[PDB]
Design a protein around this ligand. Sequence first.
Ligand SMILES: Nc1ncnc2c1ncn2[C@@H]1O[C@H](COP(=O)(O)OP(=O)(O)OP(=O)(O)O)[C@@H](O)[C@H]1O
Ligand SMILES: Nc1ncnc2c1ncn2[C@@H]1O[C@H](COP(=O)(O)OP(=O)(O)OP(=O)(O)O)[C@@H](O)[C@H]1O
Ligand SMILES: [Mg+2]
Ligand SMILES: [Mg+2]
Lengths: 338, 338, 338, 459, 338
Amino acid sequence: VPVPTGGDDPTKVAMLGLTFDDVLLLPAASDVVPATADTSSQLTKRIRLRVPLVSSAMDTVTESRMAIAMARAGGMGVLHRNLPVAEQAGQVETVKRSKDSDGRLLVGAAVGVGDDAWTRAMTLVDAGVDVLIVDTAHAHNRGVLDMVSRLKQAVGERVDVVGGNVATRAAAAALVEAGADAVKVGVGPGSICTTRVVAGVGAPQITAILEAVAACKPYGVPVIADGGLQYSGDIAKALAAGASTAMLGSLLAGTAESPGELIFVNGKQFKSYRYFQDDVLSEDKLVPERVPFRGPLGTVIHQLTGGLRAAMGYTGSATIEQLQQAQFVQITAAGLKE
Amino acid sequence: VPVPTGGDDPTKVAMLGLTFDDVLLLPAASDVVPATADTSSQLTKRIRLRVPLVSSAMDTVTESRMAIAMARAGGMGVLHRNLPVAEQAGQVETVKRSKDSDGRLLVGAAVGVGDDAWTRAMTLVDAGVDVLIVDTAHAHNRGVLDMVSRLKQAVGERVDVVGGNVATRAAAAALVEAGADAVKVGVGPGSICTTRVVAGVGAPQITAILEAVAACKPYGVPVIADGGLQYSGDIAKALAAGASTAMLGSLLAGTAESPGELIFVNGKQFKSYRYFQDDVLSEDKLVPERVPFRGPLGTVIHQLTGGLRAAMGYTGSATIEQLQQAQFVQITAAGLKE
Amino acid sequence: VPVPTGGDDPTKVAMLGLTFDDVLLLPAASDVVPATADTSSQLTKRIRLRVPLVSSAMDTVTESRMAIAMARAGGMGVLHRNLPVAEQAGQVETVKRSKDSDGRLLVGAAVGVGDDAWTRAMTLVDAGVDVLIVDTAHAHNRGVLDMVSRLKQAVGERVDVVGGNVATRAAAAALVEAGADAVKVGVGPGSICTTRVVAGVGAPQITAILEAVAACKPYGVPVIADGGLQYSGDIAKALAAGASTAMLGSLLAGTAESPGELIFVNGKQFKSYRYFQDDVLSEDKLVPERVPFRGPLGTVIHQLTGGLRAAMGYTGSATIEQLQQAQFVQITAAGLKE
Amino acid sequence: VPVPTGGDDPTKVAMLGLTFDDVLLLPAASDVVPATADTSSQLTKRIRLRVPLVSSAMDTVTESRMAIAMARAGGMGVLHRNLPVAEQAGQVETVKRSEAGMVTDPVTCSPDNTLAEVDAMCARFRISGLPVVDDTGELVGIITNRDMRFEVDQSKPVSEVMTKAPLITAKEGVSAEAALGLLRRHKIEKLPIVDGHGKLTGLITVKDFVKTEQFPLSTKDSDGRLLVGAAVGVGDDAWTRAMTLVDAGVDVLIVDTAHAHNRGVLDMVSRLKQAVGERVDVVGGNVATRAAAAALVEAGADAVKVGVGPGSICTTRVVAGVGAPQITAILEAVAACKPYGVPVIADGGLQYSGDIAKALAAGASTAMLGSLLAGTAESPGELIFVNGKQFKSYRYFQDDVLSEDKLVPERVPFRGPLGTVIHQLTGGLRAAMGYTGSATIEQLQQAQFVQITAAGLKE
Amino acid sequence: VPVPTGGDDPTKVAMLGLTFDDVLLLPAASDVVPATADTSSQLTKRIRLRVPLVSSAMDTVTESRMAIAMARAGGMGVLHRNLPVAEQAGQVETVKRSKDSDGRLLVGAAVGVGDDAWTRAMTLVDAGVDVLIVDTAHAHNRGVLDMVSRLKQAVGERVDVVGGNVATRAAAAALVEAGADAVKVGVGPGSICTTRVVAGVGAPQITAILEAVAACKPYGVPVIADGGLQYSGDIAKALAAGASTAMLGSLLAGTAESPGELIFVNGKQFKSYRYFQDDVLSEDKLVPERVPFRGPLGTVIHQLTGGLRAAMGYTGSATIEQLQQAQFVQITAAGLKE
Ligand SMILES: Nc1ncnc2c1ncn2[C@@H]1O[C@H](COP(=O)(O)OP(=O)(O)OP(=O)(O)O)[C@@H](O)[C@H]1O
Ligand SMILES: Nc1ncnc2c1ncn2[C@@H]1O[C@H](COP(=O)(O)OP(=O)(O)OP(=O)(O)O)[C@@H](O)[C@H]1O
Ligand SMILES: [Mg+2]
Ligand SMILES: [Mg+2]
């Protein structure tokens, strides 16, 4: 009668979470050449990218240079918000003035929650931003939903609103009901993540994507998988799990197009570089208190796209929409043994 | 027809035991700001702590200085019994004379089993102790239950009695029947624990807490999770599994407030410091035959409480009683790989 | 409709095998003191040992000195058969002439299969051996069963016949039907075992013990667990899984009483020391082609017995027969992480 | 309502994949002595090997030398295709003429050839003599070691130094005893055998029997020549290569692709089966599912090769996120192939001989040996000595779009003689057969597994 | 009577060679600020450099880009000769067309020995080279001396001729007699040098510089110290030992201005890139058969010049000619112990 893992509530342990290392893509009937596979996918309800990759809105990853490079590569970049409002609008305009209906490069920008966030969002919309991402560590919060709904009513006709990071079906459904044009998924997805170690909170990314897609797919809301990626195979797995686009963080932190200046210390090359880190539950609030150079962004994007095209050829997926129907095989611990 | 793991008895392998590394807290709908979360919790049926942390009754962890520091920090300390009765009463008197209804600092003390244990307990009650903990390696023994019942009849009106370490539902129910005001839970909870290696005996802490809470929650008896803690996330997980307080042992062993004198050896700082170790089945009876300095207690308590508050914010738990209703996701082996 | 692990045969993967590290002994209601716990157990149908430990019949573990020491320690030893028949009979006589009904020390000897094995067995029986072990790598063989039956018919009135190593219920049942006085269990029980790597053959020892006990318990035939032990906790787990005695191998190879001479090489102490290795499927046939000193036997035996007594105190087992009814908790991979 | 691993689709996570390290072979009732066990197994429907081991068609593993050594050991080798069609056909011809037997049609050179060419031919075919025939096929001479041992000018034409006709020759169908009598009487070592006109037909020497004594386990056709296989791709260049290999006398054609569940691979298999099915056997490329194996069987493949990302740290898994654990893949493919009698070749994922035993017990009929053979002496490459260790030292034809080299942006250690590795693998297999009571490989395919946990793998 | 180190010949061990690590510069009376120190020095009899640094003529160090950078930095570069004559002439033209009396950048080029070397030299002089270096591993050879004499007679009025690597006073005197405008010093100068290990040939660099200066200083012939340099302090020591310029080899191999393309492999950055290596006794003839990135040349040059200026300040040397009069202190083995 009692639960095999202890207690009496069978829902106390709600689910078994699978990560990227837990699953592999099963080969299927294929007439798809990797070179001829269409990797385009929807970022939001109204925006389609040639390459389903978006740079994360992290101070160490995306500012104007990275946003321009990502837009030229066929993806997009979200400008980080650890800077003043006027500076963010200036970076938005730097990206725009350098594709949309008018032929200018697409760009996204991150905003928080609050009246200061409202002013920031209005200024960014004035500067010509295309995507507003209400970015929070935990989006299953009434304030985040209120901000998403308010932005959707105010500037929904001209810009797309993306909701904060969720990890469950209920949170994704709440964001969809708030009117979000895309749902960003992932709450402590890394295995050694600071959220997992310090707060004990996390969700393995494959299960989180599956649940959020179960919430969002009926309403046509794209899913952006954010965090937990280590290799291009993880990009393929995230897209096959149901996500429409992937967000790239630490994989792009040390690239040349990312912020920071090149320095040479101890024989190795590095990139050397608060009132705006207003987000509670963020990893910087958990810690008690030099990112290496990674080369040009083009090589990293080429490697990731090559891995994705290889997966598409193996699974017989002509489009990303077909790759989202691919099947997984769950591997055991011996499958991770070197 | 036969059991898949061998034999014919399906109850031979009773359960799959989960440890802290097996589970993560699932994010849920939240309106809780981490700073405004109420971390107050019940130590016993009549005692509520501002911070649900109790320093373990270990010779290397808690004496008068540590007890005073823990009571001032909002938690409590239990004085170890690896010393003469007069010395323990003196430490109790030191803690009291430096909060109860009188306004003196709250303090607990560990007692054993036997006539000498009765003498020790009566002396400690005379000295003004608030909590008596019958601290045994294996509390599911008739002697421990009889001692708990005797203390409850004798001095139960003025002090609280907490039963020793249990790991199963039946043992916790037996302790509740004997009249224990709180149940301490954990028997070989660490992975590389000496009890697990030398004796082959142990119980994973999450499952043990779930079973003990299933036994204790209907009667309103608090559960103290003792052992297996490595990070503040483990504190959050233990409280979410249903425990009311977490007992801190080796994490406080090298703190400045812990016993021992500070010494400087080989450029590193350590702390340098039987007839009273009368408990059989204790880990010292299993071994054939220098604790590093860990800084001030305040920093450790602050970090642990910050992790707890972050978990409460992620789970939407305004109180510890709400955190006790939080759900878990079970992660695979791949989720622990670096 | 197909099996989740592949194919359409649900019995292709017969079972999930558990090893010692997969399980722990659960605590239970206990009035047992480790010092007053009775560790006696049946070695065979007619032989009871004070300490349930038998030194393995390995060339590097047991000859006359080790057999004498084991008999004096309360257990027994089995003399290895990697030597001439007259020499083995001389070792038997050396052990006997230094307990049975006549006051001489009990001793066992290993024999193979064949006519030379029959001559060896008759010589050993004439020398006064008490137990004959028909030691084979794979006892589920018609020749081994015939040898066991022949020995039981010929000399079963005076000496006990123990069957070779088995790993399944069917093999143990075949040995029992052949008249074995005890059944030795374990076939590639170690994780990095040569049989597992080279032949791909093995059986996790806890599951193997459970299956062989399911075969042997209804007929009162004791089970000797051989191999896979690393710690005294493994002794406790094996005896709780249903085995009556544990056979000690590598744990005794480098003891002072074990064969070989003491040498001092590179600052460390070591021991320095075929036509008679006629057994097929033995590990020495699978390999392409200095055992350290381990101290006195008494220390090892004392430590193992202390661990066993601690387990008996935790489980509330006054006797080994009561320990054989104890329950297990299965632990996850995270339970093994250091 | 929801799936325990997430979502609402119960088939999204189709299965739990078991690798070799997940399973052990359970001992069973056994009267099998390891030495007396029969390790013979079917490579294809018509071909049976004495040892169920095939060398992988890898450029670092199998060339003519490796193919000859594998055939002599009782297995077989598949020649890699990362080289021109002419070179691969030449390797096929080298393997076929290593142990010709029967007719033993002797390699012949024209009188217009040179000493360098005949030295190259002698090195190629491991022979010490060549008959010399004219444009019409009539004999004009013979060249041997005694004719050119110290000759200085390698440009010397064959006609200049050959032993001039007439020579000591016999007629077609001459008895073996008569040939031995001629060889003893004239003390010539290589006796030509001529037709009824004057055109050379054969050459008689007992050494072909002697080599039969040397390697009693050699796998051969009815003609007495060593069996050999060759890999082909898909396309028109692949069709030309396959026709050239069939002309050279190849025995097995393997449509070698990383992903055989593809209409091109199936069409190539069907075309080869229709065109040259009576002469050679066609083996389908790598599959990892029951449906792909069923498609290959429907295409007419004589054997199905199984494995797609089988290794744990395989490049395909890391870069593409694609793979299938090998034990589950073999079980799934055998579930489709066994009802039709189609053998399964397990390719990839092997690290120890126990894995070979497990792969055969899972239902596969042969194991294909790859990286375990890459560094052996019989493998292509030249030995070099660097530091304190010995290593092996040494695209247009890498046309597979899903091959791992397309994923990787970019020394091979020495492993000793092939015979030692083959002996160790066979010993492990025989021990497994003894433990499981399997007298034959077909009985071993019925053996049961026990699944082990993570704790069973910890050192 | 006999030699204390063996034998009867007292000149069998000719000298005790001092390396850079053997000596330190003694501080002296100083009115010299490092900022105002004049580091200009004579490269040859007729060429003066602002910074006494010459880039080594190795295939991995100096071609047109490195030569241009070195000329702009105040030093000079020598073009390597592991390439066809036309290509080296093209590189000379690239350097010249991008300082001499006509305002073009100065550049030097290495030549070998033989008739093809003469053709190469004539082509290079036609292309407008300023310095010809007859670069050989062992310049105390009649062929090198004859080549130097022929070049001096032919094109001595327009270009400066530098002799190959010597290590003794006699070799330097022979080069001066032959008409070398500068003498390059060093033969197996490194401690782990291939020439020393394979051939047993070498000369510690401080002693070699002192002897060559003893040969060259009365004739006003500058000395170029080539090889053995590890730090800027070694540059200061070499200049103080009497050398006029220092040739930089492996220190400049991985710099951006050096030949090769940048590649990023395994998280680290490297530079990736015979009939023309005709010189016998070169280290490629002795070896049986990726250079890391080192940052911009400017950082290396700035650091080396800063160290040189610090030494000039410590010794009170207003000019390099005054630094050439500085004194050394010999240090023991304990002075090298970390
Ligand atoms: N031209 C050929 N074509 C095919 N097979 C050949 C040819 N020449 C020889 N063989 C085969 O290979 C074997 C090689 O022996 P061959 O006589 O050429 O060598 P050998 O060095 O003269 O031998 P030995 O001196 O030891 O008798 C022959 O006995 C025959 O079986
Ligand atoms: N059938 C033959 N009839 C006549 N002469 C022959 C015949 N075969 C070979 N010869 C000649 O006899 C001589 C020796 O040839 P033979 O075949 O004995 O040498 P081989 O096999 O190379 O022997 P070895 O191993 O001693 O070098 C040569 O001059 C050769 O041309
Ligand atoms: Mg010969
Ligand atoms: Mg011969």
